[PDB]
């Protein structure tokens, strides 16, 4: 039985970034760049007005001048030179005509007469309200680098640079199955004796969908060694990168996941020192030519299943997808209520955390409430939980107001405020 | 010109939650529940073993006993009664046979002889390692409530309860267009004089895709009043809930977005006291029978466009989609470098924030680095920015180590660690 820190080190050392692919612009969203992106031309590519107003020769100063052209876009004012004693109308983003060296915003001007004459009311300075060529982005500047995750602003930079086919690291494809003679589909109505609905599979499909991976749903598998071997062989040869099973990893006489993974590939561990649970099998299997497939034999208890997904599977998905920082966000927070820690196993205690202007100590900070009873069979303990408090194995009661480390497991930008 | 707090109050007061719809299980992921969910049966629905081992009569105590049945699932052991002086083999999740009142885990037992006899090595207590009927979830208990956002554990609870068609609030459908005679498609190679690639549209499409809304891409629209009126009329009658335009809201003689929104609907504001920018038009339009459509005339400057999306459009999407807490997460943090605040406009200064074990004050906390020059034309200032620092309008230099409020704009659970 190994500590969680070692189990994750093992997973990190085995997990390899996937080969890069070329995708379209909107397919690149959420993916990690596998190439640097250089601007092919400057931004702006022409001297551009910051304001609606008039392009002037700054040394002319306040006075009445004829408006010799109008410049908003394209070839407007092409061939026209703004000479001393003349001005040109410009709109925001409009090309500055040759000869003009400053822009006077329309608020500092007045149109004179019934054609084309304007009164400049101020003394401007050379370069005022003009964006010189390349001031926002220089031609050939690197605007995005390999290993950078693509968000909305990064899509905007790719579009600025005219890139519509992008080299990225792909997301892994994940196969998911449930195991158990006691399971029935979640469409079941009245349950027969000794039956429960399969909840782990839909929960894991949803968890994987939140990680933006393609899912291969392999359904329910019974506690029969030959049947599970056939489904695992089919999953391995299908092209997936990760296989997630749940259940079939306890001490029962029909628990075949661990021995089948030991037969098909290399099992790095099968027991982890943590609460909730203990069994968690991690294996590397080679598909027949070929490629490597990672397998997690997740615990069957719903809580243990999702906690193991959050702690071990999420960073594996991120590493395969090329993230340079796959670790989850860890923060420090104060407990809103007392919590008893376990005397042997460090606990991943589910909590609902929020940021408060006063965390109890008179300074702003995160605070946490427990989701209640932490039994691994109680999926209600995961309900609304956006963090796992890392409780060391001391057996002591951590009083309300004490500080603990916590792993943030759900959208920190989707946190409900205090 | 109104303060941002008032502009958001106006948007909140006008924005209405969309009518609920019925979706399939996986379509419910990320959506807000529009009905409570009650468990139709208990979990477990039968007394279930916590361990692999033997179901016993606790008062029998240590001794050698015949194994009278094996119970793993379904009807295993149906009609069999465990009487004093007998035991039954059980696996985790297996139904406890009638008469047994405790489970002795296999580690506390030994199989005797070459048929079916076991030595119980301990004195157990009644109820040990048994999950009574309903201990995880009681029949008719409310497992999820209206207004709760559906994550992976909530999908798991829906599956537990046998719900595969769910009543939720839908996401709004968003139409997006760009405006400008200077724009060309982002597929353009060599740019002609006075042309830039349209970057706002792809950036906004990506931003809306991150909010999980369907996008209607209406393309580039020129600075022609009749053309923009036709596209806005077509967008309004198409069925969308929100229309996002960018550009065409400055002081130029061909900026038609504000007057067209004033003609088609009710403009609540067109100018906001904030840095970056100033113009931002918000309007409510009635589609011909019917329904309401919200329109944001976003600023054309790329930075101002995305900042206005993050501050005003994201909470509007969330309110329409039924979120009870649409406001973004705000935290308090320390500056890693000095920043000059503006003397008139409160600034939404872009930053890259991270959690540190020491934030500079000797206690853990968030810290922020500026993305550099904050000019609104400089989309590189949004690159990697996961927060907007809220700098009040004091004109003073905020030194490194000083505390400021910050809006978190990107996945807090996807934050790269220190
Ligand atoms: N797919 C599933 N959905 C809900 N509960 C499960 C699932 N698989 C296993 N379990 C339960 O988790 C516990 C451990 O299962 P196992 O790991 O197969 O021994 C037992 O109570 C099982 O009934
Ligand atoms: N879709 C767009 N992509 C990139 N820049 C834009 C876009 N629309 C407007 N701009 C620029 O933003 C500034 C303000 O534009 P406008 O709001 O139309 O006056 C000008 O420099 C425009 O060229
Ligand atoms: O895996 Mo546990 O024994 O419910 O903490
Ligand atoms: O909208 Mo600004 O004038 O670049 O701070
Ligand atoms: Mg099982
Ligand atoms: Mg324009």
Short mmCIF file of C-alpha atoms in Angstrom, two decimals, chain A residues 141-409:
data_model
loop_
_atom_site.label_atom_id
_atom_site.label_comp_id
_atom_site.label_asym_id
_atom_site.label_seq_id
_atom_site.Cartn_x
_atom_site.Cartn_y
_atom_site.Cartn_z
CA UNK A 141 6.78 38.65 -32.98
CA UNK A 142 5.90 35.40 -31.20
CA UNK A 143 2.26 35.94 -30.07
CA UNK A 144 1.71 32.40 -28.67
CA UNK A 145 4.16 29.69 -27.62
CA UNK A 146 4.26 25.90 -27.57
CA UNK A 147 2.72 24.63 -24.31
CA UNK A 148 0.27 27.53 -23.98
CA UNK A 149 -3.39 26.55 -23.43
CA UNK A 150 -5.79 28.18 -25.95
CA UNK A 151 -8.54 30.33 -24.41
CA UNK A 152 -10.73 33.01 -26.03
CA UNK A 153 -7.94 35.68 -26.17
CA UNK A 154 -5.55 33.12 -27.69
CA UNK A 155 -8.19 32.31 -30.38
CA UNK A 156 -8.35 36.09 -30.96
CA UNK A 157 -4.53 36.16 -31.40
CA UNK A 158 -4.60 33.23 -33.84
CA UNK A 159 -7.29 35.09 -35.87
CA UNK A 160 -5.25 38.34 -35.70
CA UNK A 161 -2.28 36.36 -37.18
CA UNK A 162 -4.43 34.67 -39.87
CA UNK A 163 -3.96 31.15 -38.49
CA UNK A 164 -6.97 28.93 -39.08
CA UNK A 165 -5.18 25.48 -38.91
CA UNK A 166 -3.31 24.98 -35.59
CA UNK A 167 -0.86 22.30 -34.37
CA UNK A 168 -1.99 21.19 -30.86
CA UNK A 169 -1.79 18.31 -28.45
CA UNK A 170 -5.08 16.34 -28.67
CA UNK A 171 -7.24 15.21 -25.77
CA UNK A 172 -7.02 11.49 -24.92
CA UNK A 173 -9.94 9.23 -25.89
CA UNK A 174 -11.31 7.50 -22.79
CA UNK A 175 -13.18 4.15 -22.62
CA UNK A 176 -15.45 3.66 -19.58
CA UNK A 177 -17.19 0.55 -18.25
CA UNK A 178 -18.92 -0.54 -15.04
CA UNK A 179 -18.67 -3.98 -13.47
CA UNK A 180 -21.10 -5.97 -11.37
CA UNK A 181 -23.77 -8.65 -11.34
CA UNK A 182 -25.84 -6.36 -9.04
CA UNK A 183 -26.00 -3.48 -11.59
CA UNK A 184 -28.87 -2.58 -13.88
CA UNK A 185 -29.11 0.25 -16.32
CA UNK A 186 -30.06 3.69 -14.93
CA UNK A 187 -33.23 3.48 -17.12
CA UNK A 188 -34.52 0.66 -14.80
CA UNK A 189 -37.78 1.35 -12.93
CA UNK A 190 -38.71 -1.07 -10.09
CA UNK A 191 -35.54 -2.77 -8.92
CA UNK A 192 -35.48 -6.54 -8.46
CA UNK A 193 -33.93 -7.99 -5.27
CA UNK A 194 -30.18 -7.35 -4.97
CA UNK A 195 -30.03 -4.77 -7.85
CA UNK A 196 -28.86 -1.14 -7.89
CA UNK A 197 -28.74 1.27 -10.86
CA UNK A 198 -25.31 1.74 -12.45
CA UNK A 199 -24.44 5.33 -11.32
CA UNK A 200 -20.59 5.28 -11.73
CA UNK A 201 -20.65 4.98 -15.49
CA UNK A 202 -22.88 8.02 -16.16
CA UNK A 203 -20.95 9.93 -13.43
CA UNK A 204 -17.58 9.08 -15.09
CA UNK A 205 -18.92 9.81 -18.60
CA UNK A 206 -19.96 13.27 -17.28
CA UNK A 207 -16.62 13.73 -15.46
CA UNK A 208 -14.72 12.92 -18.71
CA UNK A 209 -17.03 15.18 -20.78
CA UNK A 210 -16.10 18.04 -18.29
CA UNK A 211 -12.43 17.31 -19.16
CA UNK A 212 -13.32 17.78 -22.89
CA UNK A 213 -12.36 14.20 -23.89
CA UNK A 214 -14.17 11.90 -26.27
CA UNK A 215 -15.85 9.05 -24.38
CA UNK A 216 -16.27 5.42 -25.51
CA UNK A 217 -19.12 3.98 -23.35
CA UNK A 218 -18.54 0.19 -23.01
CA UNK A 219 -21.55 -0.39 -20.73
CA UNK A 220 -22.03 -2.84 -17.86
CA UNK A 221 -19.79 -5.90 -17.62
CA UNK A 222 -20.69 -8.87 -15.35
CA UNK A 223 -18.42 -10.47 -12.75
CA UNK A 224 -17.17 -13.12 -15.20
CA UNK A 225 -13.42 -13.31 -15.93
CA UNK A 226 -13.81 -14.31 -19.61
CA UNK A 227 -16.35 -11.55 -20.30
CA UNK A 228 -14.26 -8.81 -18.68
CA UNK A 229 -11.12 -10.08 -20.49
CA UNK A 230 -12.97 -9.81 -23.85
CA UNK A 231 -14.18 -6.26 -23.16
CA UNK A 232 -10.72 -5.17 -21.91
CA UNK A 233 -9.06 -6.73 -25.03
CA UNK A 234 -11.60 -4.93 -27.28
CA UNK A 235 -11.06 -1.61 -25.40
CA UNK A 236 -7.23 -1.92 -25.66
CA UNK A 237 -7.29 -2.56 -29.45
CA UNK A 238 -10.01 0.10 -30.17
CA UNK A 239 -7.69 3.15 -30.27
CA UNK A 240 -8.46 4.64 -26.87
CA UNK A 241 -5.73 6.14 -24.71
CA UNK A 242 -7.23 5.58 -21.26
CA UNK A 243 -9.56 2.87 -19.96
CA UNK A 244 -11.56 3.55 -16.79
CA UNK A 245 -13.27 0.61 -15.09
CA UNK A 246 -15.05 0.81 -11.74
CA UNK A 247 -15.73 -1.94 -9.24
CA UNK A 248 -14.36 -5.48 -9.34
CA UNK A 249 -11.25 -4.39 -7.35
CA UNK A 250 -12.26 -5.49 -3.79
CA UNK A 251 -11.47 -8.88 -2.06
CA UNK A 252 -14.39 -10.88 -3.50
CA UNK A 253 -14.07 -14.21 -5.27
CA UNK A 254 -15.46 -12.63 -8.51
CA UNK A 255 -13.27 -9.44 -8.57
CA UNK A 256 -11.26 -9.93 -11.81
CA UNK A 257 -10.06 -6.38 -12.72
CA UNK A 258 -6.65 -6.56 -10.91
CA UNK A 259 -5.65 -10.08 -12.14
CA UNK A 260 -6.77 -9.23 -15.70
CA UNK A 261 -4.75 -5.99 -15.75
CA UNK A 262 -1.75 -7.95 -14.33
CA UNK A 263 -2.12 -10.48 -17.22
CA UNK A 264 -2.59 -7.87 -19.98
CA UNK A 265 -0.04 -5.25 -18.90
CA UNK A 266 2.09 -3.87 -16.09
CA UNK A 267 0.29 -3.05 -12.82
CA UNK A 268 2.27 -0.30 -11.00
CA UNK A 269 0.06 -0.34 -7.87
CA UNK A 270 -3.27 -1.72 -6.61
CA UNK A 271 -3.59 -0.24 -3.05
CA UNK A 272 -3.23 3.42 -1.90
CA UNK A 273 -3.08 4.87 1.65
CA UNK A 274 -6.04 7.27 1.55
CA UNK A 275 -9.57 7.86 2.85
CA UNK A 276 -12.02 7.26 1.16
CA UNK A 277 -11.10 3.72 0.14
CA UNK A 278 -7.92 1.80 -0.56
CA UNK A 279 -8.08 -0.24 -3.84
CA UNK A 280 -7.08 1.64 -7.00
CA UNK A 281 -5.21 -0.20 -9.70
CA UNK A 282 -3.10 1.66 -12.26
CA UNK A 283 -1.69 -0.26 -15.26
CA UNK A 284 0.03 0.39 -18.58
CA UNK A 285 -1.04 -1.95 -21.44
CA UNK A 286 0.53 -2.20 -24.93
CA UNK A 287 -2.04 -2.48 -27.80
CA UNK A 288 -1.13 -5.07 -30.54
CA UNK A 289 0.57 -3.36 -33.62
CA UNK A 290 1.25 0.05 -31.76
CA UNK A 291 0.43 2.30 -28.79
CA UNK A 292 0.27 2.46 -25.02
CA UNK A 293 -3.06 2.44 -23.12
CA UNK A 294 -3.34 3.54 -19.47
CA UNK A 295 -5.91 1.68 -17.32
CA UNK A 296 -7.39 2.83 -13.97
CA UNK A 297 -9.26 0.12 -12.07
CA UNK A 298 -11.30 2.59 -10.03
CA UNK A 299 -13.03 1.58 -6.81
CA UNK A 300 -16.72 0.66 -7.10
CA UNK A 301 -17.90 2.80 -4.15
CA UNK A 302 -19.35 5.97 -5.86
CA UNK A 303 -17.45 8.44 -3.65
CA UNK A 304 -14.11 6.59 -3.88
CA UNK A 305 -14.64 6.28 -7.66
CA UNK A 306 -15.11 10.07 -8.18
CA UNK A 307 -12.43 11.09 -5.68
CA UNK A 308 -9.88 8.80 -7.46
CA UNK A 309 -11.00 10.28 -10.82
CA UNK A 310 -10.44 13.84 -9.51
CA UNK A 311 -7.04 13.14 -7.90
CA UNK A 312 -5.41 10.70 -10.32
CA UNK A 313 -7.31 10.63 -13.63
CA UNK A 314 -7.71 14.43 -14.18
CA UNK A 315 -3.89 15.13 -14.03
CA UNK A 316 -3.33 12.09 -16.33
CA UNK A 317 -5.79 13.49 -18.91
CA UNK A 318 -4.03 16.89 -18.64
CA UNK A 319 -0.51 15.36 -19.01
CA UNK A 320 -1.60 13.40 -22.10
CA UNK A 321 -3.17 16.57 -23.50
CA UNK A 322 0.21 18.40 -23.09
CA UNK A 323 -0.50 20.55 -20.03
CA UNK A 324 2.81 21.75 -18.47
CA UNK A 325 0.97 22.24 -15.09
CA UNK A 326 -1.41 19.25 -14.75
CA UNK A 327 -1.58 19.40 -10.91
CA UNK A 328 -4.86 20.67 -9.45
CA UNK A 329 -5.07 24.03 -7.74
CA UNK A 330 -4.35 23.71 -4.02
CA UNK A 331 -5.25 26.58 -1.67
CA UNK A 332 -5.17 27.05 2.12
CA UNK A 333 -8.51 27.65 3.93
CA UNK A 334 -10.20 27.80 7.31
CA UNK A 335 -12.73 25.23 8.53
CA UNK A 336 -16.24 26.63 9.26
CA UNK A 337 -16.98 23.57 11.53
CA UNK A 338 -14.94 20.94 13.45
CA UNK A 339 -13.77 17.81 11.57
CA UNK A 340 -12.30 14.61 13.02
CA UNK A 341 -9.30 13.32 11.05
CA UNK A 342 -8.66 9.56 10.71
CA UNK A 343 -5.85 8.02 12.89
CA UNK A 344 -4.32 5.99 9.93
CA UNK A 345 -5.39 7.20 6.45
CA UNK A 346 -5.05 10.83 5.19
CA UNK A 347 -8.56 11.93 4.17
CA UNK A 348 -9.86 13.69 1.05
CA UNK A 349 -12.83 15.23 2.89
CA UNK A 350 -15.47 16.75 0.57
CA UNK A 351 -16.33 20.39 1.14
CA UNK A 352 -18.17 23.38 -0.30
CA UNK A 353 -15.73 26.30 -0.22
CA UNK A 354 -16.28 29.99 -0.82
CA UNK A 355 -14.22 33.17 -0.61
CA UNK A 356 -15.17 35.46 2.30
CA UNK A 357 -14.20 39.09 3.10
CA UNK A 358 -13.55 37.76 6.66
CA UNK A 359 -12.50 34.07 6.89
CA UNK A 360 -12.78 34.12 10.74
CA UNK A 361 -9.28 35.58 11.29
CA UNK A 362 -10.28 39.19 10.34
CA UNK A 363 -8.63 38.94 6.86
CA UNK A 364 -10.16 37.72 3.54
CA UNK A 365 -9.82 34.05 2.62
CA UNK A 366 -11.44 30.78 1.65
CA UNK A 367 -13.56 28.90 4.16
CA UNK A 368 -15.00 25.37 3.94
CA UNK A 369 -18.08 23.52 5.14
CA UNK A 370 -18.09 19.72 5.20
CA UNK A 371 -20.71 17.94 3.02
CA UNK A 372 -21.54 15.80 6.12
CA UNK A 373 -21.13 12.00 6.52
CA UNK A 374 -18.11 10.92 4.40
CA UNK A 375 -18.97 7.17 3.97
CA UNK A 376 -17.70 6.04 0.52
CA UNK A 377 -21.12 4.61 -0.45
CA UNK A 378 -22.78 8.03 0.11
CA UNK A 379 -22.67 9.85 -3.22
CA UNK A 380 -24.62 12.75 -1.51
CA UNK A 381 -21.25 13.58 0.19
CA UNK A 382 -19.97 14.64 -3.36
CA UNK A 383 -23.06 16.82 -4.02
CA UNK A 384 -22.00 20.45 -4.64
CA UNK A 385 -18.46 19.62 -3.36
CA UNK A 386 -15.98 21.93 -5.14
CA UNK A 387 -12.95 20.94 -2.97
CA UNK A 388 -11.26 18.00 -1.20
CA UNK A 389 -9.75 19.01 2.16
CA UNK A 390 -6.43 17.21 2.71
CA UNK A 391 -6.71 15.97 6.28
CA UNK A 392 -3.46 14.39 7.60
CA UNK A 393 -3.69 11.07 9.51
CA UNK A 394 -3.50 12.45 13.14
CA UNK A 395 -6.79 11.16 14.64
CA UNK A 396 -7.36 14.63 16.21
CA UNK A 397 -10.39 16.89 15.96
CA UNK A 398 -9.53 19.89 13.80
CA UNK A 399 -11.51 22.72 15.39
CA UNK A 400 -13.55 25.36 13.49
CA UNK A 401 -11.23 28.18 12.41
CA UNK A 402 -8.17 25.89 11.88
CA UNK A 403 -6.31 26.05 8.53
CA UNK A 404 -6.06 23.10 6.09
CA UNK A 405 -4.88 22.49 2.52
CA UNK A 406 -7.62 21.85 -0.05
CA UNK A 407 -7.68 20.60 -3.68
CA UNK A 408 -10.09 22.56 -5.90
CA UNK A 409 -11.97 20.06 -8.09
#
